[PDB]
Amino acid sequence: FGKRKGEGFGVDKREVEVLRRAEKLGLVTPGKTPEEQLKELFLQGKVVLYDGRTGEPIEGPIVVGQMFIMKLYHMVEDKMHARSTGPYSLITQQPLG
Amino acid sequence: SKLKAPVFTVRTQGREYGEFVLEPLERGFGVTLGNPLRRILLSSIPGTAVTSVYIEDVLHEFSTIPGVKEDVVEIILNLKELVVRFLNPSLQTVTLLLKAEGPKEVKARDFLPVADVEIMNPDLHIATLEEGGRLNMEVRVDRGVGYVPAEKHGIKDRINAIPVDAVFSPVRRVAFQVEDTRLGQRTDLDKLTLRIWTDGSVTPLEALNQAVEILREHLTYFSNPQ
Amino acid sequence: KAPVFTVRTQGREYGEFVLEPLERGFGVTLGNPLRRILLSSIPGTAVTSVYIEDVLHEFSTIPGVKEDVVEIILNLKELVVRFLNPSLQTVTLLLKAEGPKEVKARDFLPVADVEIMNPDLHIATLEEGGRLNMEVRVDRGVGYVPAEKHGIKDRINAIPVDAVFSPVRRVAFQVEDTRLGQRTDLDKLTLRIWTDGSVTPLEALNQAVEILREHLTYFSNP
Amino acid sequence: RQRDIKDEVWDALEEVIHGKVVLLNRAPTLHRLGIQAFQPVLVEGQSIQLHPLVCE
Amino acid sequence: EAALRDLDEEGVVRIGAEVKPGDILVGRTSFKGESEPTPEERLLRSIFGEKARDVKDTSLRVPPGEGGIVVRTVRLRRGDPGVELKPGVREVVRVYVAQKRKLQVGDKLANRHGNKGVVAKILPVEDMPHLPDGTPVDVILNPLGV
Amino acid sequence: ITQVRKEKKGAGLEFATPEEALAAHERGEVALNAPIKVAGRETSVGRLKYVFANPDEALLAVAHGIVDLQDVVTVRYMGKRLETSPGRILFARIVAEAVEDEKVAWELIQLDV
Amino acid sequence: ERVVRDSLAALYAEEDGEVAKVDGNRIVVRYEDGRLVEYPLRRFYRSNQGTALDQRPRVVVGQRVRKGDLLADGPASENGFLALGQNVLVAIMPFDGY
Amino acid sequence: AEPGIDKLFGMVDSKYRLTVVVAKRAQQLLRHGFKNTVLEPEERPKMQTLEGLFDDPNAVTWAMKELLTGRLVFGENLVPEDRLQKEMERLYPV
DNA sequence: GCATCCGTGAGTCGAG
Ligand SMILES: [Mg+2]
């Protein structure tokens, strides 16, 4: 937030609405300043988040952060399969597996 | 009661960044104008990207060059970061040549200079070379839109050319602030600020203008009912 | 290619508008702004304030009339008024009647260039000896302004009314995926608009798109 | 040959499956609702799309 | 020639070649068995004047849904230095094919806490929820999982 | 969307006149959704302050942020004057439009929960 | 880190020394002993599961390295730390049922 | 759901009888090339192509649509199989 | 009438 303040920007109109709903949720202390409240939410790991489709915010403050995530060995590329007709089995004449 | 055309302010730092203010605007127009532009900016703004690469003595991306520290994979990954501006708008394709060797750290500035082509980040590290290490390549650069994966375009100038993923969009980031404003009689007016970062190939401003043109052009499509 | 605009209409009060194909994402890019605009900046007429002779406030109950003041002001909110004079910014409508009669919007004294779209709108039921004398202010405005926000009074004992300006009663939009040849990512925009009849869904839309286009010209000169 | 496949092929395939349904099955098939019929919608990509309401 | 294009002189696909389903990796001919040409085969063969070849096509092709760039070949023949193949085996060829796999729908992701899930939708950056400074999120995890 | 707010600022104060209640609210004495007694009966500031002719108006109000979907209010629907949230109205509408039968739709839903 | 260590994936320096050569294919190091050791790097080698095992040089020519210093990274390690996934910016919220 | 499914179930004493009737009818349509249909030109099930709207190829869709009209008669022992097949081959040759 | 022996069972699909 500090950088933002220095860059010459104040609380966005939307951050105010989210802060409203927030103090309605008992998340921030009423009467405290917008910056103080946004910080109060940040300490809870929540941030004001903007829906990229609308531009409107998410009604509540939301948990955002860095998570470590792995791509596991199971990929559709390996697993996707289909068959019309194909190899049958010696004795049973039923399709192979 | 009817509002009148707002003041349009422009604050620029070089070709990289811009801030664009519009005030005042009727309540709600902060995002009504802000968002569709952000979307268009992030998506539909034409730029330039490296489409293909040809390394002398390299058959495919999974190769490795003697004398060079970087595998062809990492090299391509670096060329992916090359931002090249075309001065002449009639020009839709370029081929940069780079021939280097000996104990040097190659950068984007080591490309043989071409007319009407400016490398916005000549400081960009490309490959680290060693004694006897020779790196000689031809990298093709195209103008295009959005994100087109190597698999899609499959662009090869020659037999051993390696198609590269093209992130065309010159726009790195877009934000917009909507702040409170008044004309004293009216409260709840909102001022809009579009903060726009770029690679430098096009300019936050140029970007913006292209975005608006795209949007209005789209509004045109509502012309002929049926 | 050039997207194809398509229209389905029911009277003057409802419309569906389809635009396809659009590049990926553009469905909501167009859809959202137009909706915000269509719900706020479309020019219409509302009832801003009301004075009832004997009545002193909103929650008072009229003797000889069934519906309490509140119900009455609500019915008023439902009054659809059309200014034929492009320059007309407001009007006062007077209505007086009595005895065993049910008062309808047509009983408002004819005024200047003014259309009452819903003449059959019920206002109040009056019994024997029941008297109704009232003046209601109709203003040209946009969007929705709660009573306490405009706070207009012609005279004392007038009660201010929540102002439903927007002739657009509802807007819904839906974007769904569309295939054009090899392209499966395309956007198809469906836009549904409900109007009170004063403007037309198509009219409303065009006014909206226009507002937007004009707003796009603001990025002209620093 | 996968490279020999034109787009009119796909368009034809869209014509082929029209109106038709296919069976989806997940194991264990505990009750008869472990198999259900759906009219398929051809999609790019390699995974099958399943309706949220039938997951249960 | 379209089918044989990327095959070197010996019949093995050339290093660097991009191969897709159906493509030939290593060409191979087998000797046709005891042949019972059907009367139809005889009338047909007669109509075109061509002769039925001695050898069937048994070449190794890329299986359905597989493929990539040819990064390696190995070739071992009977009676060349240092190599001996199981009895009866004349030669053995190995083709190593590589692929650079991007993340896609159906692929599986997890974290170290047991949260695992398949990728259901890849959203264009402008639809991604984002911070006031315009930085979009990378991943969206449903809280109902916790 | 179908849940309703319960705020404690009001804390069950009693009033003779609704106007008193509203002024109090605007002073920040009483919260919008608080259970309060006016005249005799138990009511809320929002229901009095906001009385909507039709659901379309309630929702137009929500659109403009005059109220939230979970604020309790007064809406006139199908001839009756209801005390509910715009949200619950919206739900009833969803069902209604979905089954293209409004009267049945109204029967099925439990609106008060 | 110790995991990348005990499983031989990353390549390390035997004794205090100085990097002589650095290539995509190999790393040559001159130690205190004066002896010149050459370390070949495994490059794009396939594994039982088909995942690529390759090492990449993590040092530069003329660099001073102590005994036990990292000369190369295994598959899935970053500067000698085990790297199984990526760090992404994540938001915990429902999203349109996707 | 299938259009008018509830009505279709309404028409029969057993859902499986519905299924049989529909399947058989579809077989008839296929066999005689749809030219035996009880649907009029404006009721003909349609299909979207690049070219335009063409007859829906799907005979079961047709069959159910026809069933909705009531133009079709079903039951057991209506007519000997010989007579049926042959009269249909006379009325709509293949 | 109870002890005790033998014989027969003990999820599905997938990959491999
Ligand atoms: Mg009020």
PDB file of N, CA, C and O in Angstrom, chain A residues 4 7-15 50-56, chain B residues 17 19 27 31 35 38-39 176-180 188-190 193 195:
ATOM      1  N   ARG A   4       1.796   2.622  -3.359  1.00  0.00           N
ATOM      2  CA  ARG A   4       0.593   3.233  -3.910  1.00  0.00           C
ATOM      3  C   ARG A   4       0.373   4.651  -3.382  1.00  0.00           C
ATOM      4  O   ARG A   4       0.115   5.575  -4.156  1.00  0.00           O
ATOM      5  N   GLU A   7       2.893   6.973  -4.838  1.00  0.00           N
ATOM      6  CA  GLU A   7       2.669   7.159  -6.267  1.00  0.00           C
ATOM      7  C   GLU A   7       1.521   8.128  -6.534  1.00  0.00           C
ATOM      8  O   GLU A   7       1.228   8.456  -7.685  1.00  0.00           O
ATOM      9  N   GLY A   8       0.868   8.574  -5.466  1.00  0.00           N
ATOM     10  CA  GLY A   8      -0.187   9.563  -5.586  1.00  0.00           C
ATOM     11  C   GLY A   8      -1.557   8.986  -5.886  1.00  0.00           C
ATOM     12  O   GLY A   8      -2.278   9.497  -6.746  1.00  0.00           O
ATOM     13  N   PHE A   9      -1.913   7.919  -5.175  1.00  0.00           N
ATOM     14  CA  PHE A   9      -3.244   7.326  -5.278  1.00  0.00           C
ATOM     15  C   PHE A   9      -3.828   7.079  -3.896  1.00  0.00           C
ATOM     16  O   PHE A   9      -3.127   6.678  -2.971  1.00  0.00           O
ATOM     17  N   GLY A  10      -5.124   7.320  -3.762  1.00  0.00           N
ATOM     18  CA  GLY A  10      -5.803   7.088  -2.505  1.00  0.00           C
ATOM     19  C   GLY A  10      -6.680   5.867  -2.635  1.00  0.00           C
ATOM     20  O   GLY A  10      -6.736   5.255  -3.704  1.00  0.00           O
ATOM     21  N   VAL A  11      -7.367   5.515  -1.555  1.00  0.00           N
ATOM     22  CA  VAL A  11      -8.257   4.364  -1.568  1.00  0.00           C
ATOM     23  C   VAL A  11      -9.224   4.439  -2.737  1.00  0.00           C
ATOM     24  O   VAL A  11      -9.862   5.462  -2.975  1.00  0.00           O
ATOM     25  N   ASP A  12      -9.315   3.343  -3.472  1.00  0.00           N
ATOM     26  CA  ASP A  12     -10.224   3.258  -4.590  1.00  0.00           C
ATOM     27  C   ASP A  12     -11.651   3.278  -4.065  1.00  0.00           C
ATOM     28  O   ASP A  12     -11.919   2.844  -2.942  1.00  0.00           O
ATOM     29  N   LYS A  13     -12.567   3.793  -4.875  1.00  0.00           N
ATOM     30  CA  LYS A  13     -13.977   3.794  -4.510  1.00  0.00           C
ATOM     31  C   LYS A  13     -14.459   2.401  -4.103  1.00  0.00           C
ATOM     32  O   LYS A  13     -15.258   2.263  -3.176  1.00  0.00           O
ATOM     33  N   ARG A  14     -13.959   1.376  -4.792  1.00  0.00           N
ATOM     34  CA  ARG A  14     -14.416   0.002  -4.584  1.00  0.00           C
ATOM     35  C   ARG A  14     -13.887  -0.590  -3.277  1.00  0.00           C
ATOM     36  O   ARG A  14     -14.610  -1.292  -2.551  1.00  0.00           O
ATOM     37  N   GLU A  15     -12.624  -0.298  -2.978  1.00  0.00           N
ATOM     38  CA  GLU A  15     -12.020  -0.737  -1.727  1.00  0.00           C
ATOM     39  C   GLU A  15     -12.850  -0.254  -0.543  1.00  0.00           C
ATOM     40  O   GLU A  15     -12.918  -0.913   0.497  1.00  0.00           O
ATOM     41  N   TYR A  50     -10.300  -7.709  -7.513  1.00  0.00           N
ATOM     42  CA  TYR A  50     -11.175  -7.224  -8.575  1.00  0.00           C
ATOM     43  C   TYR A  50     -11.507  -8.299  -9.595  1.00  0.00           C
ATOM     44  O   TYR A  50     -10.612  -8.896 -10.183  1.00  0.00           O
ATOM     45  N   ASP A  51     -12.797  -8.534  -9.812  1.00  0.00           N
ATOM     46  CA  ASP A  51     -13.236  -9.444 -10.858  1.00  0.00           C
ATOM     47  C   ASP A  51     -12.859  -8.877 -12.223  1.00  0.00           C
ATOM     48  O   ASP A  51     -13.344  -7.816 -12.615  1.00  0.00           O
ATOM     49  N   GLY A  52     -12.003  -9.591 -12.949  1.00  0.00           N
ATOM     50  CA  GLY A  52     -11.516  -9.116 -14.230  1.00  0.00           C
ATOM     51  C   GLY A  52     -12.591  -8.936 -15.283  1.00  0.00           C
ATOM     52  O   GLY A  52     -12.409  -8.165 -16.226  1.00  0.00           O
ATOM     53  N   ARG A  53     -13.703  -9.650 -15.138  1.00  0.00           N
ATOM     54  CA  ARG A  53     -14.798  -9.552 -16.098  1.00  0.00           C
ATOM     55  C   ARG A  53     -15.594  -8.261 -15.955  1.00  0.00           C
ATOM     56  O   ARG A  53     -15.911  -7.615 -16.948  1.00  0.00           O
ATOM     57  N   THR A  54     -15.934  -7.909 -14.716  1.00  0.00           N
ATOM     58  CA  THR A  54     -16.795  -6.763 -14.435  1.00  0.00           C
ATOM     59  C   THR A  54     -16.010  -5.500 -14.123  1.00  0.00           C
ATOM     60  O   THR A  54     -16.378  -4.406 -14.542  1.00  0.00           O
ATOM     61  N   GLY A  55     -14.933  -5.652 -13.370  1.00  0.00           N
ATOM     62  CA  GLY A  55     -14.226  -4.500 -12.860  1.00  0.00           C
ATOM     63  C   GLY A  55     -14.685  -4.225 -11.443  1.00  0.00           C
ATOM     64  O   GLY A  55     -13.981  -3.595 -10.650  1.00  0.00           O
ATOM     65  N   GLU A  56     -15.877  -4.711 -11.116  1.00  0.00           N
ATOM     66  CA  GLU A  56     -16.389  -4.613  -9.756  1.00  0.00           C
ATOM     67  C   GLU A  56     -15.570  -5.530  -8.854  1.00  0.00           C
ATOM     68  O   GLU A  56     -14.980  -6.498  -9.324  1.00  0.00           O
TER      69      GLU A  56
ATOM     70  N   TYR B  17       5.889   3.275 -19.161  1.00  0.00           N
ATOM     71  CA  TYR B  17       4.748   3.432 -18.266  1.00  0.00           C
ATOM     72  C   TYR B  17       3.940   4.695 -18.531  1.00  0.00           C
ATOM     73  O   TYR B  17       4.460   5.689 -19.040  1.00  0.00           O
ATOM     74  N   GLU B  19       0.162   7.025 -17.033  1.00  0.00           N
ATOM     75  CA  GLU B  19      -1.022   7.194 -16.207  1.00  0.00           C
ATOM     76  C   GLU B  19      -1.964   8.095 -16.978  1.00  0.00           C
ATOM     77  O   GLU B  19      -1.542   9.099 -17.542  1.00  0.00           O
ATOM     78  N   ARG B  27     -21.237   8.959 -11.728  1.00  0.00           N
ATOM     79  CA  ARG B  27     -21.015   7.863 -10.797  1.00  0.00           C
ATOM     80  C   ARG B  27     -21.152   6.518 -11.502  1.00  0.00           C
ATOM     81  O   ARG B  27     -22.141   6.268 -12.197  1.00  0.00           O
ATOM     82  N   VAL B  31     -15.574   2.308 -13.584  1.00  0.00           N
ATOM     83  CA  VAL B  31     -15.344   0.968 -14.104  1.00  0.00           C
ATOM     84  C   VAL B  31     -15.985   0.766 -15.473  1.00  0.00           C
ATOM     85  O   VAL B  31     -15.420   0.080 -16.324  1.00  0.00           O
ATOM     86  N   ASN B  35     -12.808  -0.884 -17.082  1.00  0.00           N
ATOM     87  CA  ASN B  35     -12.640  -2.316 -17.287  1.00  0.00           C
ATOM     88  C   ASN B  35     -12.530  -2.762 -18.740  1.00  0.00           C
ATOM     89  O   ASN B  35     -11.570  -3.437 -19.109  1.00  0.00           O
ATOM     90  N   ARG B  38      -9.202  -2.114 -19.882  1.00  0.00           N
ATOM     91  CA  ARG B  38      -8.225  -3.024 -19.303  1.00  0.00           C
ATOM     92  C   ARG B  38      -8.260  -4.350 -20.036  1.00  0.00           C
ATOM     93  O   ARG B  38      -7.227  -4.855 -20.460  1.00  0.00           O
ATOM     94  N   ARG B  39      -9.453  -4.908 -20.197  1.00  0.00           N
ATOM     95  CA  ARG B  39      -9.587  -6.186 -20.887  1.00  0.00           C
ATOM     96  C   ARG B  39      -8.971  -6.120 -22.286  1.00  0.00           C
ATOM     97  O   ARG B  39      -8.082  -6.905 -22.627  1.00  0.00           O
ATOM     98  N   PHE B 176      -6.505   0.189 -13.034  1.00  0.00           N
ATOM     99  CA  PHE B 176      -7.240   1.453 -13.033  1.00  0.00           C
ATOM    100  C   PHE B 176      -7.845   1.825 -11.685  1.00  0.00           C
ATOM    101  O   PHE B 176      -8.553   1.040 -11.055  1.00  0.00           O
ATOM    102  N   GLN B 177      -7.529   3.039 -11.255  1.00  0.00           N
ATOM    103  CA  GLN B 177      -8.015   3.590 -10.005  1.00  0.00           C
ATOM    104  C   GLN B 177      -9.300   4.370 -10.261  1.00  0.00           C
ATOM    105  O   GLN B 177      -9.408   5.097 -11.251  1.00  0.00           O
ATOM    106  N   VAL B 178     -10.279   4.198  -9.381  1.00  0.00           N
ATOM    107  CA  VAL B 178     -11.490   5.005  -9.416  1.00  0.00           C
ATOM    108  C   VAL B 178     -11.632   5.730  -8.097  1.00  0.00           C
ATOM    109  O   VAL B 178     -11.927   5.110  -7.076  1.00  0.00           O
ATOM    110  N   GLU B 179     -11.420   7.043  -8.111  1.00  0.00           N
ATOM    111  CA  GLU B 179     -11.430   7.798  -6.860  1.00  0.00           C
ATOM    112  C   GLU B 179     -12.588   8.781  -6.795  1.00  0.00           C
ATOM    113  O   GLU B 179     -13.151   9.146  -7.819  1.00  0.00           O
ATOM    114  N   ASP B 180     -12.944   9.218  -5.590  1.00  0.00           N
ATOM    115  CA  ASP B 180     -14.047  10.165  -5.404  1.00  0.00           C
ATOM    116  C   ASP B 180     -13.757  11.566  -5.956  1.00  0.00           C
ATOM    117  O   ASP B 180     -12.635  12.061  -5.855  1.00  0.00           O
ATOM    118  N   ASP B 188     -20.228  12.401  -5.156  1.00  0.00           N
ATOM    119  CA  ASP B 188     -20.187  11.030  -5.637  1.00  0.00           C
ATOM    120  C   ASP B 188     -19.737  10.902  -7.087  1.00  0.00           C
ATOM    121  O   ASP B 188     -19.981   9.877  -7.711  1.00  0.00           O
ATOM    122  N   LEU B 189     -19.093  11.943  -7.606  1.00  0.00           N
ATOM    123  CA  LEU B 189     -18.417  11.882  -8.897  1.00  0.00           C
ATOM    124  C   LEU B 189     -17.135  11.058  -8.778  1.00  0.00           C
ATOM    125  O   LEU B 189     -16.491  11.059  -7.729  1.00  0.00           O
ATOM    126  N   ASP B 190     -16.766  10.353  -9.844  1.00  0.00           N
ATOM    127  CA  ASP B 190     -15.560   9.527  -9.823  1.00  0.00           C
ATOM    128  C   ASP B 190     -14.553   9.868 -10.926  1.00  0.00           C
ATOM    129  O   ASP B 190     -14.919  10.004 -12.093  1.00  0.00           O
ATOM    130  N   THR B 193      -8.327   6.648 -13.454  1.00  0.00           N
ATOM    131  CA  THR B 193      -6.926   6.656 -13.854  1.00  0.00           C
ATOM    132  C   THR B 193      -6.472   5.291 -14.364  1.00  0.00           C
ATOM    133  O   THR B 193      -6.503   4.305 -13.635  1.00  0.00           O
ATOM    134  N   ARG B 195      -3.467   3.130 -15.310  1.00  0.00           N
ATOM    135  CA  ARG B 195      -2.028   2.967 -15.219  1.00  0.00           C
ATOM    136  C   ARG B 195      -1.666   1.815 -16.137  1.00  0.00           C
ATOM    137  O   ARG B 195      -2.202   0.715 -16.012  1.00  0.00           O
TER     138      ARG B 195
END
